[PDB]
């Protein structure tokens, strides 16, 4: 009686309003849905988590002074290539990259993880090009 393995099924799109929700918490729930660890037929070695589309990602909120005390930093490989970025600046430039980053930090590394993040779809503002995909709304 081997443990059950599921059949490769059509992942179900899900819409999520990032507006008002806390950054870390909402990103967490995004990670949970994206891993598909909500499904009883879960399996680790297979990407069967649901595609996710989030709207109003710019509307994300953050407790405390993280707007300016949180510094998304990056690296070029060049000497002095440590590019620091305050959170606010990252908002005005690329709000979606914030959530995409804070969720990338919450997914398992390795190729399965990358395909998971590729199953992610952040969109600042309200809209998204996925009406044909039927992104179901799901409060979190």
């Amino acid at each position: 009686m081997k443990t059950y393995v599921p059949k490769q099924v059509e992942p179900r799109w899900v819409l999520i309003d990032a507006e008002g929700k806390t950054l870390g918490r909402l990103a967490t729930k995004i990670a949970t849905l994206l891993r598909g660890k909500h499904r009883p037929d879960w399996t680790p070695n297979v990407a069967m988590g649901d595609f996710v589309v989030v709207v109003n990602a710019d509307k994300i909120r953050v407790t405390g002074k993280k707007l300016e005390q949180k510094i998304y930093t990056r690296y070029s490989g060049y000497p002095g290539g440590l590019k620091k970025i305050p959170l606010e600046k990252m908002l005005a430039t690329h709000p979606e990259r914030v959530l995409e980053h804070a969720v990338k930090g919450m997914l398992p590394k390795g190729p399965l993880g990358r395909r998971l993040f590729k199953r992610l779809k952040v969109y600042a503002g309200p809209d998204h090009p996925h009406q044909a995909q039927r992104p179901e709304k799901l409060e979190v």
């Binding site: 070029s76 060049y78 000497p79």
Partner: protein, 204 residues
């Protein structure tokens, strides 16, 4: 931002107010417009210029259709002036005028696989006092075990030149409309006949 294609015909000094101001001569016009980058259609605003004309038997079908979409003659080279909406159908030197500051861009004279001195002006080593076979080598390139590597962009050998280059804020010494010639103070990147592009300078 006005700008015209052109070709470097050579350098020369002229006498403007008892001053042998050296200049370069640039056959710029006549540049016909072939397509206009509109933001609703191309995400931004710019134009596309043809210079010089091309033998029709030397043009693939796709390019030919690209010209027939306009009313333009088949042209050898085609480029874009970013953020420039010429009203007329052919940009010429008329947009420019003497004294106007411009910025010119062209491919520098490609100096092949250039050594490290010629490419980065390193000092090399001495020519006597026992320097063994390192007269033009760059000496050390890094540190010992920490970090035990070589940083990105460490100045080494490679192709010096042969790249896009923009010398800026030059002066339009004179315009020659009937010839479509342009006399710009200072030197221009690229060999004689090398394609170049002139634009309004971004300075102030």
């Amino acid at each position: 931002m006005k700008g015209i294609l052109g070709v470097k015909v050579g350098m020369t000094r002229i006498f403007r107010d008892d001053r042998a101001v050296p200049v370069t001569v640039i056959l710029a016009g006549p540049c016909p417009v072939v397509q206009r980058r509109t933001p609703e259609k191309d995400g931004y605003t710019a134009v596309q210029l043809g210079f010089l004309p091309q033998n029709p038997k030397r043009v693939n079908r796709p390019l030919k259709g690209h010209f027939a979409k306009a009313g333009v003659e088949p042209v050898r080279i085609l480029r874009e002036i970013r953020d420039f909406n010429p009203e007329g159908d052919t940009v010429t030197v008329e947009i420019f005028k003497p004294g106007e500051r411009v910025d010119v861009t062209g491919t520098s004279k490609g100096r092949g696989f250039a050594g490290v001195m010629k490419r980065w002006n390193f000092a090399g080593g001495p020519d006597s006092h026992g320097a063994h076979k390192i007269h033009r080598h760059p000496g050390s390139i890094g540190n010992r075990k920490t970090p035990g590597r070589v940083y990105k962009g460490k100045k080494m050998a490679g192709h010096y030149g042969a790249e896009r280059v923009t010398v800026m804020n030059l002066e339009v010494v004179d315009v020659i409309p009937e010839e479509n010639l342009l006399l710009v103070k200072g030197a221009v990147p690229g060999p004689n006949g090398g394609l170049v592009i002139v634009r309004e300078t971004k300075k102030a």
